[PDB]
Design a protein around this ligand. Structure first.
Ligand code: SRM
Ligand code: SF4
Ligand SMILES: [Cl-]
Ligand SMILES: [Cl-]
Ligand SMILES: [K+]
Length: 538
């Protein structure tokens, strides 16, 4: 690699970071959008106030404003549902480590409640909240309300650092390695500039996913993150080994690889900055399918990329990885659903199943109520789109288990429901080929009626090749497709994946059978479970 390749391609101008004139050739359309107007201006210069006053029909009549609602607003966590819910916006937070409060949960519920049939909320595969039904004129008030309850939605979509994932048992687990909350909190604060916006990291070539590992279980899926912090002692000191470049896309899925770097715990933010700076400065900005950080690592080589991180560290030093980390390879991933003792004597947490991660405003109020009456007012989200309520006096558990809402959000659902994960799909998502949430519940219900099993088989449903529901990590994955019935009529289908493993012995699954009509999946899955996962016909 020539020295010329290492020239930073972006420059700070008027407090924002923009592509240098000479590097603007051959860029993708989104890169053109960002040059035409810096997206962070909608928040940091309050551009949203005036935009929110223009009727959507009028917004659509000029490129600048259409690009504002369809692209730039993702920097404020707003996603126009142009195809499937025209004029309405999904809104996505920053929620480091999946931690929410009952007050925050009630606030979100009050927003979606306003929108009636157009409103609901979802737990995401990054242990985050999304709300739906938002109309543009309401955006200024919603931003204020979020701030008032201690939430931000900044930089949650587009070419930004995504939700920092951590251990859902952080601080409460007798078996945790390190409490991940301080680190995910620090990362989120750094990314969002303490909820004011951070333009130094808002103009990346592409999305970028971070996680901090605190569990032997590897609940955080470090193998599929752009940056994963693996806890490890080096020369008598606590810190993290760094894995880099994990990603999924329609074209390519790759597991994270060692950067061959260790940082002390206090250097978590400096190294995140260094890596993001190198990605920002040097990343390819052409074909959108070749813009994720792994593509840069492949171009420069891991050592080449490492040197770029090193030069961006304070005192320009980056230690080599520690030969071992703290994560025990001898480990069985623990079920967190149900009642479990915390490390604090006399206290328990409860894991509750949220069917396909979908909640309505009344459900959200009920969960917030439970957290206040039984816990400490805290609700935790998980990447399987479930919830944990921590900090419950164990003497309160008998009463809790009699709560009517627990028949809907159960501490002990059937085993296949425990592992079921499904993306938004075509109810709201414009990229979706099929409906996912309702369909996956129906199919899973029918399958479990036919077989019993003891192995915690994990089934993931995703609506298109973007694979937001991570079908490549599943025991059985289902990727939406259109296919044909025996009469040659168009029907919704799934490509079925097998081979995905999580935890320390991770592996990416692959397509096993293409183009199966959704109406034919029950018998296929029943047989797969009996033949491959020890299930027994009822
Ligand atoms: C909500 C969520 C799925 C879910 O039901 O939980 C989701 C939903 C969407 N994803 Fe995703 N992604 C979600 C996790 C993921 C993950 C999984 C992960 O992070 O571990 C991936 C695969 C891992 C990865 O990114 O490396 C994922 C890969 C994508 C991609 C393909 C990325 C690529 O490099 O090609 C897109 C399309 C894109 O960005 O170009 C996409 C784009 C989208 C959009 C914003 C598409 C669009 O605007 O309609 C979806 C919004 C639909 C909606 O209304 O909800 N989403 N998306 C997740 C929100 C996470 C969060 O809170 O931030
Ligand atoms: S996998 Fe496809 S259908 Fe599902 S939320 Fe992501 S982009 Fe939409
Ligand atoms: Cl996005
Ligand atoms: Cl759309
Ligand atoms: K769930």
């Amino acid at each position: 690699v020539a020295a010329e390749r290492l020239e930073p391609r972006v420059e700070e101008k008027d407090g924002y970071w923009i592509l240098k004139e000479q590097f603007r050739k051959g860029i993708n359309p989104q890169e053109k959008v960002k040059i035409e107007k810096e997206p962070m201006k909608l928040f940091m210069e309050n551009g949203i106030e005036e935009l929110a006053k223009i009727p959507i029909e009028e917004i659509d009549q000029s490129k600048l404003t259409k690009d504002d609602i369809d692209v730039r607003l993702k920097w404020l966590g707003l996603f126009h549902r142009r195809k499937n819910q025209y004029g309405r916006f999904m809104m996505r937070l920053k929620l480091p480590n999946g931690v929410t409060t009952s007050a925050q949960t009630r606030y979100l519920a009050s927003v979606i409640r306003k929108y009636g049939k157009e409103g609901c909320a979802d737990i995401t595969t990054r242990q985050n909240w999304q709300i739906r039904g938002v109309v543009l004129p309401d955006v200024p008030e919603i931003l204020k309300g979020l701030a008032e309850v201690g939430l931000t939605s900044l930089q949650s979509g587009g070419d930004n650092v995504r939700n920092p994932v951590g251990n859902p048992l952080a601080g409460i687990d007798p078996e945790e390695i390190v409490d991940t909350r301080p680190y995910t909190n620090l990362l989120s604060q750094f990314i969002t500039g303490n909820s004011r916006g951070n333009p130094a990291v808002s103009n990346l070539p592409r999305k970028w996913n971070p996680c901090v590992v605190g569990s032997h279980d590897l609940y955080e899926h470090p193998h599929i993150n752009d940056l994963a912090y693996m806890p490890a002692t080096k020369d008598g000191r606590f810190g993290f080994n760094l894995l880099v470049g994990g990603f999924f896309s329609a074209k390519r899925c790759d597991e994270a690889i060692p950067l061959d770097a260790w940082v002390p715990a206090d250097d978590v933010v400096p190294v995140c900055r260094a890596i993001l700076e190198a990605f920002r400065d040097l990343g390819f900005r052409g074909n959108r399918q070749k813009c994720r950080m792994m593509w840069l690592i492949d171009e420069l080589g891991v050592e080449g990329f490492r040197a770029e991180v090193e030069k961006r560290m304070p005192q320009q030093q980056l230690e080599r990885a520690s030969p071992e980390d703290l994560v025990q390879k001898q480990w069985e991933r623990r079920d967190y659903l149900g009642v479990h003792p915390q490390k604090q004597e006399g206290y328990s947490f409860i894991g509750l199943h949220i069917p396909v991660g979908r909640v309505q405003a009344d459900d959200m109020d009920e969960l917030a109520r439970l957290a206040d009456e039984y816990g400490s007012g805290e609700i935790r989200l998980t990447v399987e789109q479930n919830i944990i309520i921590p900090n419950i006096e164990t003497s309160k558990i008998e009463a809790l288990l009699k709560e009517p809402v627990l028949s809907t959000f159960s501490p002990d659902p059937p085993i296949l429901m425990k592992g079921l994960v499904a993306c938004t799909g075509n109810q709201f998502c414009g990229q979706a080929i099929i409906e996912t949430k309702a369909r996956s519940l129906k199919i899973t219900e029918e399958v479990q009626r036919q077989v019993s099993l003891t192995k915690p088989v994990r089934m993931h449903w995703t609506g298109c090749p973007n694979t937001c529901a991570q079908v490549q990590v599943a025991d059985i994955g289902f990727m939406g497709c259109l296919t044909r019935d025996k009469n040659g009529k168009t029907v919704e289908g799934a490509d079925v994946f097998l081979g995905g493993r999580i935890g320390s012995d991770s592996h990416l699954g692959e397509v096993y059978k293409k183009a199966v009509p959704c109406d034919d999946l029950v018998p296929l899955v029943v047989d797969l479970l009996v033949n491959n996962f020890g299930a027994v016909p009822r």
